Subunit: 331 residues, 2 copies
Amino acid sequence: QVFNFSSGPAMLPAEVLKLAQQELVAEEAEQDFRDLLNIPSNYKVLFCHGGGRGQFAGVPLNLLGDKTTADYVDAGYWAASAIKEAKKYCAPQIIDAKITVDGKRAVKPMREWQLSDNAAYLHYCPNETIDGIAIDETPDFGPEVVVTADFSSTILSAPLDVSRYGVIYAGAQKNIGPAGLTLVIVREDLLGKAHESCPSILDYTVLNDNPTFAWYLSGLVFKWLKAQGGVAAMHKINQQKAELLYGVIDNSDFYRNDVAQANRSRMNVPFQLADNTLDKVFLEESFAAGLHALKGHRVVGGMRASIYNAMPIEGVKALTDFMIDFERRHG
Amino acid sequence: QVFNFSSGPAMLPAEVLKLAQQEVAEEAEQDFRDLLNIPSNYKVLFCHGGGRGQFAGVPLNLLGDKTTADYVDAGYWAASAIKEAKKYCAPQIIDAKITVDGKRAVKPMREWQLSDNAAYLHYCPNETIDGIAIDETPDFGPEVVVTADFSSTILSAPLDVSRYGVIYAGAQKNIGPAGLTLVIVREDLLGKAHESCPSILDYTVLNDNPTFAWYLSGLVFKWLKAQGGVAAMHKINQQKAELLYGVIDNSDFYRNDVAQANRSRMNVPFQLADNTLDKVFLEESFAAGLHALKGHRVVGGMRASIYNAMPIEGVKALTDFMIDFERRHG
Ligand SMILES: [Ca+2]
Ligand SMILES: [Ca+2]
């Protein structure tokens, strides 16, 4: 059978597809999303068209207010993209959180992040798909820090204390499934200060007032999640999926992963082959074994396996069985 | 069977769904280019969102070093575009609304007072709520950059794309799939987006570097080609329009106040002579399988959208219903 380990567009749960097949709703989707994550009533939830990239502009356009600076954490590619886009609207104060721990790539803990007092908000990316770096720490800054975070590749994989954030956004294409949809969770008191020239389609206050198909699909994905035991159940399953894959990579001298354990992503697992010359055959033999889209991003090279909610444990097992046999044959 | 006359979100063609029922992306653009005969000096962008985004996207990409643009107001969507443009420039408003033979009309293009300092000219060729269409082919000088919101009529007729600077259309109306917006832009207009234009709205960035609505559109474009293309579609829409307007005009019971020359072939608003019967018309038509005919809250009355996907059998069921309703309530 075929398993697709692509980071985006990512796979759709086996059942959602089937349900989609046999049934061929509206407002329920949002309620289900609020229920799944236990979103407090003081948070507005917006469903807008477009990918997550839009919010690289959306956040500064809605939250700078009359301020001209904002704190941005750089710990990888998407965080750096957010920063490049923010320069159009403010002078971001860049917090370089990249460090080496035990010879591997890691990220400084939040208490060491140097925030500036004039910052309009703080922005960070809890999961970098290309780098395989995750920041799982729950934010706990004072009530004067407005925390904004890009949860595109990890929303719905673990419980989340939404109350600790100002804005949480996520393109639906990675961990939810349907492409073309973006979710924005926004603390209500932050509404009302969008730049006068912010396009209406990006204005949180305007959208807060006044339905695709990706909406329907997501609706089914939320029901499926609830039926699986929700975000707590998904967290358990993802924890085992990650352990199985990282376990195989670490017990082999043939496969390598250079990210500190505390910052290892549970959704995107990049790895290299010790003998780099075998990359071609690895991609050819894996592809010819039902294991799709493993080539790492051009920027980094190597291999990358995305194991989102939709990816079952059987899919990860097939990948690991293949890696072991391949090392057995080329090692 | 059920026929849905909603202006947006709109109906999908029967075959596209059956084809879709079982079970790629790059052909979609080539098929769109071919349907409309888009010249090679135009870029075609497929992006997310509805057409509303372009109310901002056009001025953000085309103002350049100018601070004004000419905007034609002959309806609701044209007025909304103007309202959004005030965020980026001082629009020079051309009031094209006139009365002809006692009915709502639009001033011919040669009477549009253009400004020399304008970065472009914007107009809406088909107003869904007002049922007003401006079918005239633009033929302004080469110093006029014409931009237009074709959301509600794209693909319903042949179009001389070479006469425009930018043509944009949300797909939710005449193509079907919500979530997709198509922008056709003459390549020489690229490269002057405002430095603060968000990247998702920047034509130059989108051009430099896929959804499901993308796949559906591909099916719709293939379906259109199999029907004989835009020329065929135009012919069928003409007949659908003639039937609906014909029945409305031949009755004293139903009224439409739009001048013949500006009658939309896609959005047909109408009132009942005795408007107290509005509730009953909606309940009985809904019960007869004729859905979403309620005219927009503002204008009131009734409105039937008859896009490419709406077959003539649907228009005929609507008219047979209108005729029987007059028999029973007239
Ligand atoms: Ca290893
Ligand atoms: Ca009449």
